[PDB]
Design a protein around this ligand. Structure first.
Ligand SMILES: O=C(O)c1cc(O)c(O)c(O)c1
Length: 470
């Protein structure tokens, strides 16, 4: 209710500690803060964790109470609900380890709970489908910025972080600062009266640009007709993590035919983005999907391999690399992708029977799931409607670089593992190039043999943050 003034009180902070690399890290915690006045789901609370020094007038890693970066990680995966995280949390999902390391680094951490596609209200109604995830992230950001000074840390140094769907969340927050599209939703929640633009973005394998991901997936994997992914088994770990196991399949003749069309359409989509290299050349693909853009993907994988090679890693785990002397001189991309293996079938994102996480994400209070591409709606195997075009646009980070309607974070660090096949490499690469093209700071790479995952390079992430903030 409006009795919730959304005013943070440092008096709420209580002392705790956690071991990191065999040493005690002292911090203060305040949990379960209702960050909007009119929440519709119990998950909509946030936790605040502060390096202990900041409650005693001292410094950590060059930062003080007033100047410390504010890291805002999320636990969103598969566009499911992401509970408020905690350095003490052991239940799945969690990035507790990252919070612990962040505190050691001197960052204030504000970990918000975020609704997801399965979130229902007290009456069992669905209230977490798009764009709930990003509304909640923005509401938490507004809570933080509204409470500048009261909350330890610099509210002008908010850095979001997340993996996969959570990476898309982080990227979207960075791209869509103060967009008018979300104002109605935020007003309805009674979010704090403040801005929601942020300082920097960290994103691991952001699963985004969903309405073009099917074309990108087939551009990449056409010609590879076996797929290998996971399905759930009964039971969880003691900490609630769902159990999985490998299951393979083979594309049908019909899927193979559909793949070829999706692949062909990608060339036009890609070309019409008008992406450029550093020297300014238009990056493109021809009718058969070859060209300068394809060469960029290849080069990024060669760079990834060289970095691993120099560390003594055997890059011939995967096929296609040409090593001359101690230099990775070339790559047969098709061969690499074949050894890497296709994970998803066709279409990979907009499934014709509405069964994908993305389909459910684009459902609403009436329909459990929707299509979000013309192709899938046309080819639908079940009764279905297309999601609202503006909504699709609104939750795509790219939209804010290509049609200005927001304030964009100046600093971006994006990673997508060289072994990650949840989405085509073209997807994060398009984001990175578009960022660079529009003058934003972008640190991008495809780390060698890293699977679908995040937070695996914390030393480097934190050095990047410190480079921006100290
Ligand atoms: O958050 C994830 O792990 C995730 C989310 C997705 O929407 C998705 O299509 C995927 O392959 C992985």
């Amino acid at each position: 209710s409006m009795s919730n003034r959304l005013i943070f009180d440092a008096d709420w902070l209580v002392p705790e500690q956690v071991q990191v690399a065999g040493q005690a890290i002292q911090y203060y915690a305040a949990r379960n803060i209702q960050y909007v006045q009119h929440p519709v789901a119990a998950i909509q609370v946030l936790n605040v964790f502060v390096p202990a020094a900041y409650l005693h007038g001292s410094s950590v890693n060059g930062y003080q109470r007033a100047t410390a970066p504010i890291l805002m990680p999320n636990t969103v995966g598969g566009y499911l609900p992401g509970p408020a995280d905690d350095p003490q949390r052991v239940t799945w999902p969690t990035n507790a380890g990252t919070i612990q390391q962040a505190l050691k680094r001197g960052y204030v951490v504000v970990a918000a709970g975020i609704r997801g596609r399965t979130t229902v209200d007290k009456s069992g109604q669905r209230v977490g489908q798009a764009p709930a995830f990003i509304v909640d992230m923005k509401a938490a950001i507004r809570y933080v910025k509204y409470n500048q000074g009261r909350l330890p840390g610099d509210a002008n140094r908010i850095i979001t972080n997340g993996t996969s769907a959570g990476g898309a969340t982080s990227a979207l927050a960075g791209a869509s600062g103060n967009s008018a599209y979300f104002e109605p939703a935020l007003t309805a929640l009674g979010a704090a009266p403040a801005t929601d633009d942020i300082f920097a973005v960290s994103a691991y394998c952001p699963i985004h640009n969903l309405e073009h991901a099917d074309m990108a997936y087939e551009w990449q994997f056409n010609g590879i007709n076996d797929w290998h992914r996971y399905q759930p088994v009964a039971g969880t770990t003691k900490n609630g993590r769902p159990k999985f196991e490998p299951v393979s399949g083979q594309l049908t003749v019909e899927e193979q035919a559909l793949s070829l069309a999706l692949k062909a359409q990608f060339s036009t989509y890609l070309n019409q983005l008008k992406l450029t290299a550093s020297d300014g050349t238009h990056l493109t693909l021809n009718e058969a999907g070859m060209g300068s853009f394809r060469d960029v993907v290849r080069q990024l994988l060669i760079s990834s391999a060289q970095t691993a090679f120099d560390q003594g890693t055997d890059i011939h785990k995967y096929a296609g690399f040409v090593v001359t002397g101690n230099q990775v001189t070339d790559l047969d991309l098709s061969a690499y992708l074949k050894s890497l293996t296709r994970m998803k079938a066709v279409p990979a994102f907009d499934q014709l029977d509405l069964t994908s996480p993305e389909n459910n994400l684009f459902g609403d209070a009436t329909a459990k799931a929707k299509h979000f591409t013309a192709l899938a709606q046309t080819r639908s195997t079940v009764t279905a409607q297309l999601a609202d075009a503006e909504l699709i646009q609104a939750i795509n980070p790219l939209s804010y670089l290509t049609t200005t309607s927001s304030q964009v974070a100046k600093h971006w660090r994006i990673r997508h593992g060289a072994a990650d096949r949840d989405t085509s490499f073209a997807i994060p690469i398009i984001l990175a190039i578009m960022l660079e093209n529009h003058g934003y700071g972008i640190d991008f790479a495809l780390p060698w043999d890293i699977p679908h995952s995040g937070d695996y390079d914390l030393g480097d992430l934190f050095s990047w943050i410190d480079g921006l903030c100290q």
